[PDB]
Design a binder for this molecule. Structure first.
Ligand SMILES: *[C@@H]1O[C@H](CO)[C@@H](O[C@@H]2O[C@H](CO)[C@@H](O)[C@H](O)[C@H]2NC(C)=O)[C@H](O)[C@H]1NC(C)=O
Ligand SMILES: *[C@@H]1O[C@H](CO)[C@@H](O[C@@H]2O[C@H](CO)[C@@H](O)[C@H](O)[C@H]2NC(C)=O)[C@H](O)[C@H]1NC(C)=O
Ligand SMILES: *[C@@H]1O[C@H](CO)[C@@H](O[C@@H]2O[C@H](CO)[C@@H](O)[C@H](O)[C@H]2NC(C)=O)[C@H](O)[C@H]1NC(C)=O
Ligand SMILES: *[C@@H]1O[C@H](CO)[C@@H](O[C@@H]2O[C@H](CO)[C@@H](O)[C@H](O)[C@H]2NC(C)=O)[C@H](O)[C@H]1NC(C)=O
Ligand SMILES: *[C@@H]1O[C@H](CO)[C@@H](O[C@@H]2O[C@H](CO)[C@@H](O)[C@H](O)[C@H]2NC(C)=O)[C@H](O)[C@H]1NC(C)=O
Ligand SMILES: *[C@@H]1O[C@H](CO)[C@@H](O[C@@H]2O[C@H](CO)[C@@H](O)[C@H](O)[C@H]2NC(C)=O)[C@H](O)[C@H]1NC(C)=O
Ligand SMILES: *[C@@H]1O[C@H](CO)[C@@H](O[C@@H]2O[C@H](CO)[C@@H](O)[C@H](O)[C@H]2NC(C)=O)[C@H](O)[C@H]1NC(C)=O
Ligand SMILES: *[C@@H]1O[C@H](CO)[C@@H](O[C@@H]2O[C@H](CO)[C@@H](O)[C@H](O)[C@H]2NC(C)=O)[C@H](O)[C@H]1NC(C)=O
Lengths: 413, 133, 192
C-alpha cells in the first residue's frame, strides 16, 4: 500500500465594505446634496445591501470554524505511536500560536492604496481575529488526534492513535491486523508525506490562487470605484467646486445632475457585483463547512469528496480568507493477478465466501480479503453453503476442510 | 498626495479628513434606555479635540469624553466599560470585541469573546473511554 | 414592495411627481421634457427591483435544493454523513410544513455516561496473536473482556470473538491472557 496526503484550498470570506453615498456622490456641498435628495431612496438600498453582505461574511467563518463545543488540548508529552504531527500542531515559541504550515500560508498570501479610500469608503474589520481562528483549528486538531470521531457526536472519548487508525482501516475495508503488523512503516509513510506538503506549496507560486484572487478582485473593484469619481459624464469639468464657482446656479444644477447620475450608476454596478461575488463566496463557505463536518469530524465514504483514494482522515489549517484541508488517504500499490472462481464444488454443495474472494496461482486455492493479498486455507468457517453445483456458472472442483471432523476422528480413535 | 510649498522649498503630504460611521449599541428598549456609541475606524485622541462649539456634524455631543472611553481596533467606544473577563458574545462590535448589558449595579460592558469552555482529553497510549448509557 | 411603491412619489428633477398635474399645466413641448425625467427614474427603480428579485430567487433556490436533499436523505433513509441530519448518530427525521418552508425534526443519539479502562491491541495465548472480530479488549484492572465499541457490554474472550493472525513478536503492546476454546471444554468431559 501507500499513504498519501493531499491539499484542498477553499475560500470562506471576503472583505467587508461600507459606503457613504452622500460623501461619494457629493463633494461636501450643500446644494448638490439638495439635488441628490430629489432622487428618493436609492441610497438606503445600497446601504442595506452592503450591511447584509457584511453580516453574511461574518456568518460564513462562524459556520466553517466554530464547530466545537469545548476547546481541547494535546497532552504535554507527544508520542502518538510514531506518527509525528509537529508540522500541523501550533508551536509556543512564536508570539502567534500557529503551526509552521499556517505560518507559511500567512506569509505567502500578500494582502498608498489605503490612503485613497477616503471618499466615503470604509473597510470593516472581521469579528473573529486570526488568533481566534487559529485556536479553533488547534481545538479541532487536538480533538481529532486525542479522541477520533467521538467528539463530533457526543463527549470526547480517548483512544490510542494506532487503535484509532485500526478503526479507520476497518472503515475502508481492510482488517486491522494489517495495521499492527506494518505500523512503523505506515507511520514512516505519513512522516514522509506531511513533509512533502511543506515544499509542495513552497516551490509552486500559484498554489494559493483562490485567496489571492479574492484579494485582487476586492482591490480592483475598490480602485475602479475610486477612479470613476474623476470622470466627466458629459460636463465641462468633473470637479464640483470649479463647476459650482464658474457658472450660475440654473445651468449648474441641470449640469451637475449628469455627474449625480454617473456616480450613482457606478455605485449601483459596484453593489450588484459585490452581491454576485458574495453569493459565490457563500456557496464556497457552505462547501467548506460541509467538508469540515464530514472529512474532519468523521470518516467519509463518498468517492473523491475528501481527496483521491480511500479516505482515512483529514486535518484543518487556517489561511487568510480561507481554509486548507490536508486529506490523508490510503492508495493501493503493487498488485498481482490470479485466477478466480465464483464458488467451490465440494460434495455436491456450492461454497461462497463470507468475505473475500477465491484466488489461485495455478496449483491451490485460497480465500483472501479483497483490498490486500492475505491468502488463507478454505474451511467451513470462511465459506457458506447454498444449493447444489449445477446452477452456478464457473464453479470449480476443490476441497473444503472441516476443522471439526479431523479432531473428532483423531481423538475418538 | 504631496505638495511643495512655493514659498519655502520643502515637501508636505496631504492627509484627508478623518470621517466615518457612527453606530449605536443598545439592549432592548423594554430593558433599558442607555446606549453606547462607536465611532468606526477612528483613533479617539482626536475625537476629544474635535468636540468644539457647534462645529462637528452630529449635533449631540453630550457624552464627549465623560469616562468609559475605550480604543478598539474597530474604532472608539464611548459609554461602555472594558472588563478583564470573557463571556459569550452578545452584541458584536468587531475585532474579537463584543458588548453586553450585565451586572457588576447594571450597565453596558465591553469584553473579548470566550471561544468556549476549556478541556483537556486525558490521552494515554493504553487507556480508553467507553460509554455505558 | 414598499420601496417600489414609495419610489413612485419622487420628482427625479421634474416640477412635480404627479403626471396628470404635469399634463394639465404645461404645453406638450415642455410636457414631454418634464415627463422624460419621471420615465427614466421609474425605469431605473423597476430594473433595480427585478435584479434584486433575481438574486434573492437564486438564494432561495439553493436552500430549496438543500431541503429537497435533506428530505430525500434524512427522512426517506438513514444517513451516515456527519452533522447532516442533526447532532449525534442519526436515527430518524420527521417533516413539518411551515409558511414558506419546512422544519425537520432530527432524532439522534448521544452517548451519555462513560467509564475509563485499559486496552491492548492483541492477545498472546499460545504464541499466536488474537485480534477482535468486532469490539475492543477491555480490562477493569484484573480480568479482560471483549466489548462492542459504542456500548459497554463485556464478554468472555473466546475463539468465537477473536481471529488469529501470526505470532506475538510483531504487534507493539500485546499482553498475556488466556483464550477459552469452547470445543475442548465440552470434548474433554463427555468422552471420558
Ligand atoms: C517530527 O518532525 C520534525 C520535523 O518536522 C522533527 O524535528 C527535527 O528534529 C531533528 C532532531 O532533533 C532536527 O535535526 C531537525 O532540525 C528537526 N526539524 C525541524 C523542522 O525542526 C521532529 O523531531 C519529529 N518528532 C519526533 C518526536 O521525532
Ligand atoms: C511496500 O512499499 C513500501 C514503500 O512504500 C516498501 O518499503 C520499502 O522497502 C524497501 C525494501 O526493503 C526498503 O529499501 C525501503 O526503505 C522501504 N521503505 C520504507 C518507507 O520503509 C515495502 O517494502 C513494500 N512492501 C512489500 C511487501 O513489498
Ligand atoms: C500458490 O501459492 C501457495 C502459497 O501457499 C503455494 O502453496 C504451497 O507451496 C509450497 C511450495 O513449497 C508447498 O510446500 C505447500 O504445500 C503449498 N501449500 C498448500 C496449502 O498446498 C503454491 O505452491 C503456489 N504455487 C506455485 C506454483 O508457486
Ligand atoms: C468436479 O467437477 C466436475 C465438473 O467440472 C464433475 O464432473 C462431472 O460431474 C457430474 C455431476 O456430478 C457427473 O455426473 C459426471 O460423471 C462428472 N464427470 C466425470 C468425467 O466424472 C465432478 O463430479 C466434480 N467432482 C469430482 C470429485 O471430480
Ligand atoms: C506510553 O507513553 C510513554 C510516555 O508518553 C511512551 O514513552 C515514549 O516511548 C517512545 C518509544 O516507544 C520514545 O520515543 C519516547 O521518548 C517515550 N517518551 C517518554 C519517555 O516520555 C511509551 O511508549 C508508552 N509506554 C510503554 C510502556 O511503551
Ligand atoms: C441510562 O440513563 C437513564 C436516563 O436517561 C437512566 O434512567 C434513570 O435511572 C435513575 C435510577 O433508577 C432514575 O432515578 C431516573 O428517573 C431514570 N430516568 C429516566 C428518564 O427514566 C438509566 O438508569 C441509565 N442506566 C444506567 C445503567 O445507568
Ligand atoms: C472485573 O470484572 C469481573 C467481572 O466478572 C469481576 O470479577 C467478579 O467480581 C465479583 C465481585 O467481587 C466476584 O463476585 C466474582 O466472583 C468475580 N468473578 C471472577 C470470575 O473472578 C472483577 O472483580 C472485576 N475487577 C475489578 C477490579 O473490579
Ligand atoms: C507472556 O508475555 C511475556 C512477555 O511479556 C512472555 O515472556 C517471555 O517469553 C519468552 C518466550 O517464551 C521468554 O524467552 C522470555 O524469557 C520471557 N520473558 C520474561 C521476562 O520472562 C511470555 O512468554 C508470555 N507467556 C506466558 C505464558 O507467560
Amino acid at each position: 500500500f501507500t499513504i498519501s496526503v493531499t491539499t484542498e484550498i477553499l475560500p470562506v470570506s471576503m472583505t467587508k465594505t461600507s459606503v457613504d453615498c452622500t460623501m461619494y456622490i457629493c463633494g461636501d456641498s450643500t446644494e448638490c446634496s439638495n439635488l441628490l435628495l430629489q432622487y428618493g431612496s436609492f441610497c438606503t438600498q445600497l446601504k442595506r445591501a452592503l450591511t447584509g453582505i457584511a453580516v453574511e461574511q461574518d456568518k460564513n467563518t462562524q459556520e466553517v470554524f466554530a464547530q466545537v463545543k469545548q476547546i481541547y488540548k494535546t497532552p504535554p508529552i507527544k508520542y502518538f505511536g510514531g506518527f509525528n504531527f509537529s508540522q500541523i500542531l501550533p508551536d509556543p515559541s512564536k508570539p502567534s500560536k500557529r503551526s509552521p504550515i499556517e505560518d507559511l500560508l500567512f506569509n505567502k498570501v500578500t494582502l498608498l492604496i489605503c490612503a485613497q479610500k477616503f471618499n466615503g469608503l470604509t473597510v470593516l474589520p472581521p469579528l473573529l481575529t486570526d488568533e481566534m481562528i487559529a485556536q479553533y483549528t488547534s481545538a479541532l486538531l487536538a480533538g481529532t488526534i486525542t479522541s477520533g470521531w467521538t467528539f463530533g457526536a457526543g463527549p470526547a472519548l480517548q483512544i490510542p492513535f494506532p487503535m484509532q487508525m485500526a478503526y479507520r482501516f476497518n472503515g475502508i475495508g481492510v482488517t486491522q491486523n494489517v495495521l499492527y503488523e506494518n505500523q512503523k512503516l505506515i507511520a514512516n509513510q505519513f512522516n514522509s508525506a506531511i513533509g512533502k506538503i511543506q515544499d509542495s506549496l513552497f516551490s509552486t507560486p500559484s498554489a494559493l490562487g483562490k485567496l489571492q484572487d479574492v484579494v485582487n478582485h476586492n482591490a480592483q473593484a475598490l480602485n475602479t470605484l475610486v477612479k470613476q469619481l474623476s470622470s466627466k459624464f458629459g460636463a465641462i469639468s468633473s470637479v464640483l467646486n470649479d463647476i459650482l464657482s464658474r457658472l450660475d446656479p440654473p445651468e449648474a444644477e441641470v449640469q451637475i445632475d449628469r455627474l449625480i447620475t454617473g456616480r450613482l450608476q457606478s455605485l449601483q454596478t459596484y453593489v450588484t457585483q459585490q452581491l454576485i461575488r458574495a453569493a459565490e463566496i457563500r456557496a464556497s463557505a457552505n462547501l467548506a463547512a460541509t467538508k469540515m463536518s464530514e472529512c474532519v469530524l468523521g470518516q467519509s465514504k463518498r468517492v473523491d469528496f475528501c481527496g483521491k483514494g480511500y479516505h482515512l482522515m483529514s486535518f484543518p489549517q487556517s489561511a487568510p480568507h480561507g481554509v486548507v484541508f490536508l486529506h490523508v488517504t490510503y492508495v493501493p500499490a503493487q498488485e498481482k493477478n490470479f485466477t478466480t472462481a465464483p464458488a467451490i464444488c465440494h460434495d455436491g454443495k456450492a461454497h461462497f465466501p463470507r468475505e473475500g474472494v477465491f484466488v489461485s496461482n495455478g496449483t491451490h486455492w485460497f480465500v483472501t480479503q479483497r483490498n490486500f493479498y492475505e491468502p488463507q486455507i478454505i474451511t467451513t468457517d470462511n465459506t457458506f453453503v447454498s444449493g447444489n453445483c449445477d446452477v452456478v456458472i464457473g464453479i470449480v472442483n476443490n476441497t473444503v476442510y472441516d476443522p471439526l471432523q479431523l479432531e473428532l476422528d483423531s481423538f475418538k480413535e | 498626495d504631496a505638495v511643495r510649498d512655493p514659498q519655502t522649498l520643502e515637501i508636505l503630504d496631504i492627509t484627508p479628513c478623518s470621517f466615518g460611521g457612527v453606530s449605536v449599541i443598545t439592549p432592548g428598549t423594554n430593558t433599558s434606555n442607555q446606549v453606547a456609541v462607536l465611532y468606526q475606524g477612528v483613533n479617539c485622541t482626536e475625537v476629544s479635540v474635535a468636540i468644539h462649539a457647534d462645529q462637528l456634524t452630529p449635533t449631540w455631543r453630550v457624552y464627549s469624553t465623560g469616562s468609559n472611553v475605550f480604543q478598539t481596533r474597530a474604532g472608539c467606544l464611548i459609554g461602555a466599560e472594558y472588563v478583564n473577563n470573557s463571556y459569550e458574545c452578545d452584541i458584536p462590535i468587531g475585532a474579537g470585541i463584543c458588548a453586553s448589558y450585565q451586572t457588576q449595579s447594571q450597565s453596558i460592558i465591553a469584553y473579548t469573546m470566550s471561544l468556549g469552555a476549556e478541556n483537556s482529553v486525558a490521552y494515554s497510549n493504553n487507556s480508553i473511554a467507553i460509554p455505558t448509557n
